[PDB]
Amino acid sequence: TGYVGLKNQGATCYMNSLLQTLFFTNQLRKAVYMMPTEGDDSSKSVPLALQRVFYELQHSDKPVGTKKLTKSFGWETLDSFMQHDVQELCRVLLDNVENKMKGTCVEGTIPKLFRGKMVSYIQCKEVDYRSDRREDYYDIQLSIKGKKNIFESFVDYVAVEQLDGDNKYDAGEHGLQEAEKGVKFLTLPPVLHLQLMRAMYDPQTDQNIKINDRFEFPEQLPLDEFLQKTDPKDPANYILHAVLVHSGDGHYVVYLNPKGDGKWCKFDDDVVSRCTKEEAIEHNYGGCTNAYMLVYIRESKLSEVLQAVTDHDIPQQLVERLQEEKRIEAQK
Ligand SMILES: COc1cnccc1-c1ccc(C(=O)N2CC[C@@H](C(=O)N3CCC(O)(Cn4cnc5c(ccn5C)c4=O)CC3)[C@H](c3ccccc3)C2)s1
């Protein structure tokens, strides 16, 4: 493979899977390295700690650890991971980084990479009144129960809902109204984080029940037909980068093809093996082991996103600090 694993330090669950997905977002990695953590607290700093994991992933020949990172964002006490969805762990990390990059030359990399735009509208069926609000989004949550595949989930996602008796829209001056609500996509970003809604509410066992149902997703994904305006110059065609997997009800795993080239690996904690396309994609449709999150890259943008990273893409200042820091760790 040429690729190093992560040590599975706590019940950090999905974290290793997420870290790897993020690491192989090369345009993100190289921005991360440029963050000015010169005088950042060694242990309190989330942005430092991420630089450390990345550094190590790029250099270590031996499984990489996460303790200082876990501690940094204070997710240690058991339940810290269970209580949160994978996209929340993402948000925490990216938000920290987004903010650290403020006032620098790499200011703006996060939104640049992950933020798409969207419109929620309410349209009264009988009256002229229409509310329009554009929203930003860094990730998309798809319904799967009773959907075959991505297309059916996306369909549902932009589906029109009717606001009738009881759910009647309060149209302000025009009282209650039969009205229809929907969402529609203005843009998609270079990198597309999709989460599949496999946990749902239990009015019985009162826990999060996992839906192991088959759900189908393609290696290539066209989305122009979900846009308002399409663009000939750059269509919304997406390339499958990463499949975050979970089996049971739990072991966590992630398949990547880091260069987007269909050369897949399986990343299970310390153990990284090359794997077949089948093992990565169809084998994880489900029906138990199955995907819960996908990562697509916009074909047009692959080469900037997955731009090559050299060892000289780490500031030598940063290297110095980490090397010293590693050295001083000398147990009798
Ligand atoms: C015995 O306890 C242990 C001891 N030692 C180590 C580990 C444990 C464990 C304890 C519990 C484990 C477990 O099995 N859990 C808990 C976490 C949970 C998890 O990893 N999640 C991330 C993916 C997730 O966010 C995806 N997602 C995001 N947003 C959503 C939905 C649905 C609606 N919305 C708005 C959604 O499904 C769901 C939660 C697991 C899971 C996996 C797949 C599908 C559903 C749910 C279920 S493992």
Side-chain angles (χ1 to χ4, degrees), residues 7-37 39-42:
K7 300 183 288 182
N8 172 201
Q9 229 121 18
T12 55
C13 290
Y14 37 79
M15 188 184 67
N16 295 12
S17 308
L18 183 60
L19 287 166
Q20 293 274 46
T21 309
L22 288 180
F23 176 80
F24 288 106
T25 307
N26 299 16
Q27 186 175 351
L28 175 61
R29 195 203 309 171
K30 285 173 58 175
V32 162
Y33 284 153
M34 292 306 308
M35 296 187 306
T37 52
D40 278 52
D41 175 293
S42 206

PDB file of all heavy atoms in Angstrom, residues 7-42, unseen atoms left out:
ATOM      1  N   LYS A   7      -3.485   3.727  15.445  1.00  0.00           N
ATOM      2  CA  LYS A   7      -3.777   2.948  16.637  1.00  0.00           C
ATOM      3  C   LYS A   7      -5.185   3.311  17.105  1.00  0.00           C
ATOM      4  O   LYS A   7      -5.546   4.492  17.110  1.00  0.00           O
ATOM      5  CB  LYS A   7      -2.699   3.218  17.693  1.00  0.00           C
ATOM      6  CG  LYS A   7      -1.282   2.853  17.263  1.00  0.00           C
ATOM      7  CD  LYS A   7      -0.211   3.043  18.332  1.00  0.00           C
ATOM      8  CE  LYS A   7       0.131   4.467  18.628  1.00  0.00           C
ATOM      9  NZ  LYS A   7       1.195   4.621  19.619  1.00  0.00           N
ATOM     10  N   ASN A   8      -5.979   2.295  17.491  1.00  0.00           N
ATOM     11  CA  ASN A   8      -7.375   2.494  17.848  1.00  0.00           C
ATOM     12  C   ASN A   8      -7.498   2.758  19.340  1.00  0.00           C
ATOM     13  O   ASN A   8      -7.901   1.865  20.071  1.00  0.00           O
ATOM     14  CB  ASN A   8      -8.229   1.267  17.546  1.00  0.00           C
ATOM     15  CG  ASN A   8      -9.650   1.358  18.074  1.00  0.00           C
ATOM     16  OD1 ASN A   8     -10.305   0.325  18.245  1.00  0.00           O
ATOM     17  ND2 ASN A   8     -10.153   2.549  18.373  1.00  0.00           N
ATOM     18  N   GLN A   9      -7.270   4.006  19.765  1.00  0.00           N
ATOM     19  CA  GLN A   9      -6.769   4.256  21.108  1.00  0.00           C
ATOM     20  C   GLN A   9      -7.860   4.087  22.168  1.00  0.00           C
ATOM     21  O   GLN A   9      -7.630   3.447  23.192  1.00  0.00           O
ATOM     22  CB  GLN A   9      -6.024   5.589  21.130  1.00  0.00           C
ATOM     23  CG  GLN A   9      -4.652   5.477  21.790  1.00  0.00           C
ATOM     24  CD  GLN A   9      -3.517   5.880  20.868  1.00  0.00           C
ATOM     25  OE1 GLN A   9      -3.718   6.554  19.851  1.00  0.00           O
ATOM     26  NE2 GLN A   9      -2.300   5.500  21.226  1.00  0.00           N
ATOM     27  N   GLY A  10      -9.037   4.678  21.948  1.00  0.00           N
ATOM     28  CA  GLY A  10     -10.155   4.467  22.854  1.00  0.00           C
ATOM     29  C   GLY A  10     -11.231   3.622  22.185  1.00  0.00           C
ATOM     30  O   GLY A  10     -10.966   2.914  21.218  1.00  0.00           O
ATOM     31  N   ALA A  11     -12.455   3.709  22.712  1.00  0.00           N
ATOM     32  CA  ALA A  11     -13.638   3.555  21.886  1.00  0.00           C
ATOM     33  C   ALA A  11     -13.905   4.906  21.229  1.00  0.00           C
ATOM     34  O   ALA A  11     -14.844   5.615  21.579  1.00  0.00           O
ATOM     35  CB  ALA A  11     -14.815   3.078  22.703  1.00  0.00           C
ATOM     36  N   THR A  12     -13.013   5.268  20.301  1.00  0.00           N
ATOM     37  CA  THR A  12     -13.159   6.456  19.486  1.00  0.00           C
ATOM     38  C   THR A  12     -14.027   6.140  18.273  1.00  0.00           C
ATOM     39  O   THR A  12     -14.304   7.026  17.480  1.00  0.00           O
ATOM     40  CB  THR A  12     -11.768   6.956  19.109  1.00  0.00           C
ATOM     41  OG1 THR A  12     -11.062   5.887  18.480  1.00  0.00           O
ATOM     42  CG2 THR A  12     -10.984   7.362  20.343  1.00  0.00           C
ATOM     43  N   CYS A  13     -14.440   4.876  18.121  1.00  0.00           N
ATOM     44  CA  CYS A  13     -15.400   4.478  17.105  1.00  0.00           C
ATOM     45  C   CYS A  13     -14.950   4.929  15.706  1.00  0.00           C
ATOM     46  O   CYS A  13     -13.960   4.434  15.168  1.00  0.00           O
ATOM     47  CB  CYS A  13     -16.788   4.988  17.486  1.00  0.00           C
ATOM     48  SG  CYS A  13     -17.533   4.146  18.914  1.00  0.00           S
ATOM     49  N   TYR A  14     -15.646   5.933  15.152  1.00  0.00           N
ATOM     50  CA  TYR A  14     -15.529   6.314  13.752  1.00  0.00           C
ATOM     51  C   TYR A  14     -14.321   7.215  13.502  1.00  0.00           C
ATOM     52  O   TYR A  14     -14.023   7.533  12.355  1.00  0.00           O
ATOM     53  CB  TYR A  14     -16.794   7.051  13.301  1.00  0.00           C
ATOM     54  CG  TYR A  14     -17.432   7.970  14.337  1.00  0.00           C
ATOM     55  CD1 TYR A  14     -16.925   9.237  14.602  1.00  0.00           C
ATOM     56  CD2 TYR A  14     -18.571   7.577  15.035  1.00  0.00           C
ATOM     57  CE1 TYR A  14     -17.522  10.074  15.534  1.00  0.00           C
ATOM     58  CE2 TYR A  14     -19.173   8.404  15.969  1.00  0.00           C
ATOM     59  CZ  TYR A  14     -18.649   9.656  16.218  1.00  0.00           C
ATOM     60  OH  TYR A  14     -19.262  10.461  17.126  1.00  0.00           O
ATOM     61  N   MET A  15     -13.631   7.624  14.569  1.00  0.00           N
ATOM     62  CA  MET A  15     -12.687   8.717  14.464  1.00  0.00           C
ATOM     63  C   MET A  15     -11.558   8.315  13.532  1.00  0.00           C
ATOM     64  O   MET A  15     -11.153   9.092  12.673  1.00  0.00           O
ATOM     65  CB  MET A  15     -12.112   9.095  15.828  1.00  0.00           C
ATOM     66  CG  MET A  15     -11.272  10.350  15.769  1.00  0.00           C
ATOM     67  SD  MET A  15     -10.507  10.730  17.352  1.00  0.00           S
ATOM     68  CE  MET A  15      -9.374   9.330  17.437  1.00  0.00           C
ATOM     69  N   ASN A  16     -11.036   7.104  13.705  1.00  0.00           N
ATOM     70  CA  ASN A  16      -9.940   6.666  12.857  1.00  0.00           C
ATOM     71  C   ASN A  16     -10.394   6.745  11.396  1.00  0.00           C
ATOM     72  O   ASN A  16      -9.703   7.340  10.568  1.00  0.00           O
ATOM     73  CB  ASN A  16      -9.390   5.314  13.305  1.00  0.00           C
ATOM     74  CG  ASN A  16      -8.742   5.374  14.672  1.00  0.00           C
ATOM     75  OD1 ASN A  16      -8.884   6.369  15.392  1.00  0.00           O
ATOM     76  ND2 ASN A  16      -8.045   4.321  15.070  1.00  0.00           N
ATOM     77  N   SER A  17     -11.576   6.186  11.093  1.00  0.00           N
ATOM     78  CA  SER A  17     -12.158   6.236   9.757  1.00  0.00           C
ATOM     79  C   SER A  17     -12.191   7.670   9.218  1.00  0.00           C
ATOM     80  O   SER A  17     -11.826   7.908   8.067  1.00  0.00           O
ATOM     81  CB  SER A  17     -13.563   5.637   9.729  1.00  0.00           C
ATOM     82  OG  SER A  17     -13.640   4.333  10.295  1.00  0.00           O
ATOM     83  N   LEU A  18     -12.633   8.619  10.054  1.00  0.00           N
ATOM     84  CA  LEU A  18     -12.793  10.004   9.644  1.00  0.00           C
ATOM     85  C   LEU A  18     -11.432  10.628   9.375  1.00  0.00           C
ATOM     86  O   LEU A  18     -11.243  11.235   8.334  1.00  0.00           O
ATOM     87  CB  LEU A  18     -13.567  10.806  10.689  1.00  0.00           C
ATOM     88  CG  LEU A  18     -13.871  12.268  10.340  1.00  0.00           C
ATOM     89  CD1 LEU A  18     -14.698  12.369   9.073  1.00  0.00           C
ATOM     90  CD2 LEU A  18     -14.577  12.998  11.472  1.00  0.00           C
ATOM     91  N   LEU A  19     -10.499  10.457  10.313  1.00  0.00           N
ATOM     92  CA  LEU A  19      -9.155  10.997  10.189  1.00  0.00           C
ATOM     93  C   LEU A  19      -8.565  10.605   8.842  1.00  0.00           C
ATOM     94  O   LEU A  19      -7.949  11.441   8.199  1.00  0.00           O
ATOM     95  CB  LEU A  19      -8.233  10.527  11.312  1.00  0.00           C
ATOM     96  CG  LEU A  19      -8.482  11.134  12.695  1.00  0.00           C
ATOM     97  CD1 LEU A  19      -7.750  10.354  13.777  1.00  0.00           C
ATOM     98  CD2 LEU A  19      -8.059  12.580  12.737  1.00  0.00           C
ATOM     99  N   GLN A  20      -8.739   9.345   8.431  1.00  0.00           N
ATOM    100  CA  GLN A  20      -8.066   8.848   7.238  1.00  0.00           C
ATOM    101  C   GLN A  20      -8.660   9.528   6.001  1.00  0.00           C
ATOM    102  O   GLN A  20      -7.934   9.993   5.119  1.00  0.00           O
ATOM    103  CB  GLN A  20      -8.072   7.316   7.166  1.00  0.00           C
ATOM    104  CG  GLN A  20      -7.230   6.626   8.239  1.00  0.00           C
ATOM    105  CD  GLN A  20      -5.762   6.446   7.894  1.00  0.00           C
ATOM    106  OE1 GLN A  20      -5.082   7.359   7.409  1.00  0.00           O
ATOM    107  NE2 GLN A  20      -5.232   5.262   8.173  1.00  0.00           N
ATOM    108  N   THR A  21      -9.995   9.595   5.962  1.00  0.00           N
ATOM    109  CA  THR A  21     -10.720  10.300   4.920  1.00  0.00           C
ATOM    110  C   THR A  21     -10.212  11.733   4.782  1.00  0.00           C
ATOM    111  O   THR A  21     -10.168  12.271   3.675  1.00  0.00           O
ATOM    112  CB  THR A  21     -12.203  10.328   5.280  1.00  0.00           C
ATOM    113  OG1 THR A  21     -12.590   8.986   5.575  1.00  0.00           O
ATOM    114  CG2 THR A  21     -13.016  10.977   4.171  1.00  0.00           C
ATOM    115  N   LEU A  22      -9.968  12.379   5.926  1.00  0.00           N
ATOM    116  CA  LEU A  22      -9.534  13.762   5.955  1.00  0.00           C
ATOM    117  C   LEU A  22      -8.088  13.860   5.502  1.00  0.00           C
ATOM    118  O   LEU A  22      -7.746  14.789   4.777  1.00  0.00           O
ATOM    119  CB  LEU A  22      -9.716  14.345   7.352  1.00  0.00           C
ATOM    120  CG  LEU A  22     -11.173  14.596   7.756  1.00  0.00           C
ATOM    121  CD1 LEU A  22     -11.182  15.165   9.150  1.00  0.00           C
ATOM    122  CD2 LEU A  22     -11.945  15.530   6.831  1.00  0.00           C
ATOM    123  N   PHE A  23      -7.252  12.918   5.943  1.00  0.00           N
ATOM    124  CA  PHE A  23      -5.841  12.950   5.611  1.00  0.00           C
ATOM    125  C   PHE A  23      -5.680  12.912   4.094  1.00  0.00           C
ATOM    126  O   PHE A  23      -4.933  13.716   3.533  1.00  0.00           O
ATOM    127  CB  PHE A  23      -5.072  11.809   6.283  1.00  0.00           C
ATOM    128  CG  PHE A  23      -3.597  11.735   5.903  1.00  0.00           C
ATOM    129  CD1 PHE A  23      -2.663  12.572   6.505  1.00  0.00           C
ATOM    130  CD2 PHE A  23      -3.144  10.831   4.947  1.00  0.00           C
ATOM    131  CE1 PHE A  23      -1.325  12.515   6.156  1.00  0.00           C
ATOM    132  CE2 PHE A  23      -1.810  10.785   4.598  1.00  0.00           C
ATOM    133  CZ  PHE A  23      -0.900  11.620   5.207  1.00  0.00           C
ATOM    134  N   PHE A  24      -6.428  12.025   3.432  1.00  0.00           N
ATOM    135  CA  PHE A  24      -6.257  11.840   1.998  1.00  0.00           C
ATOM    136  C   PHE A  24      -7.020  12.907   1.205  1.00  0.00           C
ATOM    137  O   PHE A  24      -7.072  12.832  -0.021  1.00  0.00           O
ATOM    138  CB  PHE A  24      -6.640  10.414   1.600  1.00  0.00           C
ATOM    139  CG  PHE A  24      -5.626   9.375   2.051  1.00  0.00           C
ATOM    140  CD1 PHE A  24      -5.898   8.522   3.109  1.00  0.00           C
ATOM    141  CD2 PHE A  24      -4.407   9.255   1.400  1.00  0.00           C
ATOM    142  CE1 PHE A  24      -4.967   7.574   3.508  1.00  0.00           C
ATOM    143  CE2 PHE A  24      -3.473   8.312   1.802  1.00  0.00           C
ATOM    144  CZ  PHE A  24      -3.754   7.473   2.854  1.00  0.00           C
ATOM    145  N   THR A  25      -7.619  13.881   1.891  1.00  0.00           N
ATOM    146  CA  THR A  25      -8.026  15.124   1.266  1.00  0.00           C
ATOM    147  C   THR A  25      -6.809  16.044   1.233  1.00  0.00           C
ATOM    148  O   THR A  25      -6.634  16.878   2.115  1.00  0.00           O
ATOM    149  CB  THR A  25      -9.191  15.708   2.065  1.00  0.00           C
ATOM    150  OG1 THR A  25     -10.155  14.659   2.138  1.00  0.00           O
ATOM    151  CG2 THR A  25      -9.784  16.944   1.414  1.00  0.00           C
ATOM    152  N   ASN A  26      -5.951  15.863   0.226  1.00  0.00           N
ATOM    153  CA  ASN A  26      -4.591  16.384   0.259  1.00  0.00           C
ATOM    154  C   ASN A  26      -4.596  17.905   0.322  1.00  0.00           C
ATOM    155  O   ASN A  26      -3.760  18.498   0.998  1.00  0.00           O
ATOM    156  CB  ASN A  26      -3.759  15.984  -0.953  1.00  0.00           C
ATOM    157  CG  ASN A  26      -3.588  14.492  -1.082  1.00  0.00           C
ATOM    158  OD1 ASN A  26      -4.315  13.711  -0.454  1.00  0.00           O
ATOM    159  ND2 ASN A  26      -2.660  14.081  -1.929  1.00  0.00           N
ATOM    160  N   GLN A  27      -5.515  18.543  -0.406  1.00  0.00           N
ATOM    161  CA  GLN A  27      -5.569  19.994  -0.419  1.00  0.00           C
ATOM    162  C   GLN A  27      -5.857  20.515   0.985  1.00  0.00           C
ATOM    163  O   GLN A  27      -5.410  21.606   1.343  1.00  0.00           O
ATOM    164  CB  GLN A  27      -6.609  20.511  -1.405  1.00  0.00           C
ATOM    165  CG  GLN A  27      -6.602  22.025  -1.557  1.00  0.00           C
ATOM    166  CD  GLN A  27      -7.554  22.497  -2.629  1.00  0.00           C
ATOM    167  OE1 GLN A  27      -8.106  21.686  -3.386  1.00  0.00           O
ATOM    168  NE2 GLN A  27      -7.736  23.809  -2.705  1.00  0.00           N
ATOM    169  N   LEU A  28      -6.602  19.726   1.773  1.00  0.00           N
ATOM    170  CA  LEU A  28      -6.862  20.055   3.167  1.00  0.00           C
ATOM    171  C   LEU A  28      -5.604  19.832   4.003  1.00  0.00           C
ATOM    172  O   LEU A  28      -5.258  20.660   4.841  1.00  0.00           O
ATOM    173  CB  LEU A  28      -8.019  19.230   3.721  1.00  0.00           C
ATOM    174  CG  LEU A  28      -8.300  19.396   5.217  1.00  0.00           C
ATOM    175  CD1 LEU A  28      -8.660  20.836   5.511  1.00  0.00           C
ATOM    176  CD2 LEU A  28      -9.400  18.443   5.674  1.00  0.00           C
ATOM    177  N   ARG A  29      -4.934  18.700   3.773  1.00  0.00           N
ATOM    178  CA  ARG A  29      -3.769  18.352   4.564  1.00  0.00           C
ATOM    179  C   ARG A  29      -2.739  19.480   4.488  1.00  0.00           C
ATOM    180  O   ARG A  29      -2.240  19.927   5.526  1.00  0.00           O
ATOM    181  CB  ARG A  29      -3.206  17.012   4.084  1.00  0.00           C
ATOM    182  CG  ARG A  29      -2.222  16.350   5.039  1.00  0.00           C
ATOM    183  CD  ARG A  29      -1.289  15.359   4.338  1.00  0.00           C
ATOM    184  NE  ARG A  29      -2.006  14.380   3.510  1.00  0.00           N
ATOM    185  CZ  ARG A  29      -1.411  13.542   2.683  1.00  0.00           C
ATOM    186  NH1 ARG A  29      -0.095  13.441   2.667  1.00  0.00           N
ATOM    187  NH2 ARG A  29      -2.137  12.784   1.890  1.00  0.00           N
ATOM    188  N   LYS A  30      -2.471  19.962   3.262  1.00  0.00           N
ATOM    189  CA  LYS A  30      -1.392  20.910   3.016  1.00  0.00           C
ATOM    190  C   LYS A  30      -1.736  22.286   3.578  1.00  0.00           C
ATOM    191  O   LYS A  30      -0.850  23.056   3.948  1.00  0.00           O
ATOM    192  CB  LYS A  30      -1.084  21.069   1.525  1.00  0.00           C
ATOM    193  CG  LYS A  30      -0.326  19.902   0.898  1.00  0.00           C
ATOM    194  CD  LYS A  30      -0.155  19.974  -0.616  1.00  0.00           C
ATOM    195  CE  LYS A  30       0.549  21.213  -1.100  1.00  0.00           C
ATOM    196  NZ  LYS A  30       0.774  21.135  -2.539  1.00  0.00           N
ATOM    197  N   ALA A  31      -3.030  22.604   3.605  1.00  0.00           N
ATOM    198  CA  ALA A  31      -3.469  23.805   4.285  1.00  0.00           C
ATOM    199  C   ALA A  31      -3.200  23.661   5.778  1.00  0.00           C
ATOM    200  O   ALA A  31      -2.686  24.576   6.415  1.00  0.00           O
ATOM    201  CB  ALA A  31      -4.931  24.050   4.003  1.00  0.00           C
ATOM    202  N   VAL A  32      -3.565  22.500   6.330  1.00  0.00           N
ATOM    203  CA  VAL A  32      -3.475  22.255   7.761  1.00  0.00           C
ATOM    204  C   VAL A  32      -2.057  22.554   8.232  1.00  0.00           C
ATOM    205  O   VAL A  32      -1.863  23.317   9.178  1.00  0.00           O
ATOM    206  CB  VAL A  32      -3.909  20.806   8.059  1.00  0.00           C
ATOM    207  CG1 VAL A  32      -3.448  20.301   9.419  1.00  0.00           C
ATOM    208  CG2 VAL A  32      -5.415  20.649   7.932  1.00  0.00           C
ATOM    209  N   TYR A  33      -1.082  21.988   7.512  1.00  0.00           N
ATOM    210  CA  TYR A  33       0.327  22.144   7.832  1.00  0.00           C
ATOM    211  C   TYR A  33       0.750  23.615   7.916  1.00  0.00           C
ATOM    212  O   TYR A  33       1.643  23.954   8.687  1.00  0.00           O
ATOM    213  CB  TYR A  33       1.080  21.407   6.722  1.00  0.00           C
ATOM    214  CG  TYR A  33       1.090  19.887   6.782  1.00  0.00           C
ATOM    215  CD1 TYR A  33       1.232  19.135   5.619  1.00  0.00           C
ATOM    216  CD2 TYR A  33       1.045  19.201   7.994  1.00  0.00           C
ATOM    217  CE1 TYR A  33       1.287  17.752   5.657  1.00  0.00           C
ATOM    218  CE2 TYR A  33       1.089  17.814   8.039  1.00  0.00           C
ATOM    219  CZ  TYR A  33       1.208  17.086   6.868  1.00  0.00           C
ATOM    220  OH  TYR A  33       1.268  15.725   6.907  1.00  0.00           O
ATOM    221  N   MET A  34       0.125  24.483   7.109  1.00  0.00           N
ATOM    222  CA  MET A  34       0.499  25.886   7.025  1.00  0.00           C
ATOM    223  C   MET A  34      -0.062  26.698   8.193  1.00  0.00           C
ATOM    224  O   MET A  34       0.168  27.903   8.241  1.00  0.00           O
ATOM    225  CB  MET A  34      -0.029  26.519   5.727  1.00  0.00           C
ATOM    226  CG  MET A  34       0.620  26.017   4.455  1.00  0.00           C
ATOM    227  SD  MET A  34       2.422  26.136   4.464  1.00  0.00           S
ATOM    228  CE  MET A  34       2.704  27.847   4.932  1.00  0.00           C
ATOM    229  N   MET A  35      -0.811  26.084   9.117  1.00  0.00           N
ATOM    230  CA  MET A  35      -1.417  26.828  10.209  1.00  0.00           C
ATOM    231  C   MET A  35      -0.319  27.292  11.170  1.00  0.00           C
ATOM    232  O   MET A  35       0.612  26.550  11.478  1.00  0.00           O
ATOM    233  CB  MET A  35      -2.465  25.977  10.933  1.00  0.00           C
ATOM    234  CG  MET A  35      -3.656  25.611  10.059  1.00  0.00           C
ATOM    235  SD  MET A  35      -4.994  24.777  10.941  1.00  0.00           S
ATOM    236  CE  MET A  35      -4.107  23.413  11.709  1.00  0.00           C
ATOM    237  N   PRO A  36      -0.383  28.540  11.686  1.00  0.00           N
ATOM    238  CA  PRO A  36       0.691  29.074  12.522  1.00  0.00           C
ATOM    239  C   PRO A  36       0.501  28.615  13.959  1.00  0.00           C
ATOM    240  O   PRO A  36      -0.060  29.341  14.770  1.00  0.00           O
ATOM    241  CB  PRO A  36       0.504  30.583  12.348  1.00  0.00           C
ATOM    242  CG  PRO A  36      -1.006  30.754  12.212  1.00  0.00           C
ATOM    243  CD  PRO A  36      -1.486  29.499  11.493  1.00  0.00           C
ATOM    244  N   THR A  37       0.951  27.392  14.249  1.00  0.00           N
ATOM    245  CA  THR A  37       0.881  26.848  15.593  1.00  0.00           C
ATOM    246  C   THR A  37       2.207  27.031  16.327  1.00  0.00           C
ATOM    247  O   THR A  37       2.456  26.342  17.310  1.00  0.00           O
ATOM    248  CB  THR A  37       0.504  25.380  15.496  1.00  0.00           C
ATOM    249  OG1 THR A  37       1.439  24.848  14.566  1.00  0.00           O
ATOM    250  CG2 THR A  37      -0.905  25.177  14.979  1.00  0.00           C
ATOM    251  N   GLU A  38       3.030  27.973  15.851  1.00  0.00           N
ATOM    252  CA  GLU A  38       4.312  28.297  16.460  1.00  0.00           C
ATOM    253  C   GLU A  38       4.174  28.309  17.982  1.00  0.00           C
ATOM    254  O   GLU A  38       4.851  27.557  18.683  1.00  0.00           O
ATOM    255  CB  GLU A  38       4.823  29.632  15.905  1.00  0.00           C
ATOM    256  N   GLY A  39       3.284  29.159  18.500  1.00  0.00           N
ATOM    257  CA  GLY A  39       3.190  29.364  19.935  1.00  0.00           C
ATOM    258  C   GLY A  39       1.891  28.802  20.494  1.00  0.00           C
ATOM    259  O   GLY A  39       1.355  29.344  21.455  1.00  0.00           O
ATOM    260  N   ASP A  40       1.401  27.701  19.909  1.00  0.00           N
ATOM    261  CA  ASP A  40       0.181  27.057  20.379  1.00  0.00           C
ATOM    262  C   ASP A  40       0.490  26.070  21.494  1.00  0.00           C
ATOM    263  O   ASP A  40       1.440  25.293  21.398  1.00  0.00           O
ATOM    264  CB  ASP A  40      -0.554  26.308  19.280  1.00  0.00           C
ATOM    265  CG  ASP A  40      -1.435  27.194  18.422  1.00  0.00           C
ATOM    266  OD1 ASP A  40      -0.912  28.213  17.929  1.00  0.00           O
ATOM    267  OD2 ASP A  40      -2.635  26.871  18.265  1.00  0.00           O
ATOM    268  N   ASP A  41      -0.378  26.073  22.514  1.00  0.00           N
ATOM    269  CA  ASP A  41      -0.236  25.170  23.643  1.00  0.00           C
ATOM    270  C   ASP A  41      -0.185  23.744  23.118  1.00  0.00           C
ATOM    271  O   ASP A  41      -0.991  23.352  22.282  1.00  0.00           O
ATOM    272  CB  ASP A  41      -1.362  25.314  24.654  1.00  0.00           C
ATOM    273  CG  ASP A  41      -1.343  24.305  25.796  1.00  0.00           C
ATOM    274  OD1 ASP A  41      -1.553  23.102  25.530  1.00  0.00           O
ATOM    275  OD2 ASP A  41      -1.122  24.732  26.946  1.00  0.00           O
ATOM    276  N   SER A  42       0.762  22.973  23.651  1.00  0.00           N
ATOM    277  CA  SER A  42       1.071  21.669  23.097  1.00  0.00           C
ATOM    278  C   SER A  42      -0.150  20.749  23.201  1.00  0.00           C
ATOM    279  O   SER A  42      -0.430  20.009  22.258  1.00  0.00           O
ATOM    280  CB  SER A  42       2.292  21.088  23.767  1.00  0.00           C
ATOM    281  OG  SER A  42       2.941  20.168  22.903  1.00  0.00           O
TER     282      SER A  42
END
